[PDB]
Write a protein that binds this ligand. Sequence first.
Ligand code: HEM
Ligand SMILES: CC1(C)[C@@H]2CC[C@@]1(C)C(=O)C2
Length: 408
Amino acid sequence: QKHRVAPPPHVPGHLIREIDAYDLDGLEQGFHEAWKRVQQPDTPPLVWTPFTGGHWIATRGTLIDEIYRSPERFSSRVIWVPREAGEAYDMVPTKLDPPEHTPYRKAIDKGLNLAEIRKLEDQIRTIAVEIIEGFADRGHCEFGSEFSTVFPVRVFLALAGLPVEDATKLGLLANEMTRPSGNTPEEQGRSLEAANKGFFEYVAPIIAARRGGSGTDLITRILNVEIDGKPMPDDRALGLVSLLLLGGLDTVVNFLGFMMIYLSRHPETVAEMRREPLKLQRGVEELFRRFAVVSDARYVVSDMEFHGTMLKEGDLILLPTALHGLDDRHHDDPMTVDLSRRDVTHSTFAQGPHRCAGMHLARLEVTVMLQEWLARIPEFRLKDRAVPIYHSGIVAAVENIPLEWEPQ
Ligand code: HEM
Ligand SMILES: CC1(C)[C@@H]2CC[C@@]1(C)C(=O)C2
């Protein structure tokens, strides 16, 4: 039984669509495929679902792009559904609009800018090689538990100066943030609240130990950037360090799983990457277009008409980022990976002032991953009749990816 809410007075019947972001219709065929079902040739640009507390969904890439770019009309004061979860959410600076957002983003960019990220290449490669070597001679692995959930977590915990043994407990908090348990808006709100508190509890001693510290880790570097001529306050520090961990640990893990399932079903594409190493390097952005993972929201600042649709102040609009990169109005044959695609425009990293601060790190992890994978395991396929298990929510997830190959 799905929890359902009545449409408010300003939502007309013809825009209503029953869409469950946390359990998409057709999800067993894939996350991307399930979102694609919503984007039909005649579907309105904005549709309203009675599920997950009642909210709008942007169904086309240009609205998604525009909403992300327009913080004055669509605020980050609530970026989750259901509303209860969005109100419990306390991460920084992702809860803030400009101008409050901008000193915190500048602080993060001190640690995460492209020139900083470039320095990490060989440490990332070393981690990738060590994991791949554990199974490359074997001719099979379950890619999810043996690589995708291992590689990005080891990379991030090392960068953040944290013990790898914390991976499990941080992964559990991350799940309840992005895929909160519950069958009610209030239950999901409560699950997110508990996860968010868990992050704060974990992060507090690290902030206390690393304020003015001399560690060269990511957390010490960012935490000690002044905000408006002063040390960053405790409340903001909790939200900020928690965000670093959430962003570092959930995203690349899930991205890698979707990407790899597709590659394992497209040997011709894998072979191109092998024959032309520059096609691989240059084609990574195409993979980001193709394997979006985030579906999050914005809060309507005032009563307005937007793309022919009446919106009320306080309305939540969900932005399924897959519906930008996979929009057939933005990209021909959008479900196909074309490494030579000249136009890869997407919102996988969102847009506007919150456009992913970790995007350089994400690109490098993936580039390194594919380079070291193809070096040791040039050819591979998904196990015959294997059925990956898919999850939808604010961040998509996938498990059960059994790969097979002839040891080279
Ligand atoms: C597959 C890779 C990734 C994807 C698809 C992704 C996606 C996104 C998206 C969509 C946003 C915008 C959220 C919003 O305002 O609604 C975001 C922001 C952010 N991400 Fe990433 N992310 C990824 C990797 C990472 C990594 C590895 C980090 C490292 C910690 C990271 C750190 C951040 C931070 C700190 C923000 C907030 C930026 C701000 O508010 O100015 N992300 N990410
Ligand atoms: C949606 C995100 C990927 C972005 C960074 C981590 C994440 C889950 C957030 O809370 C904001």
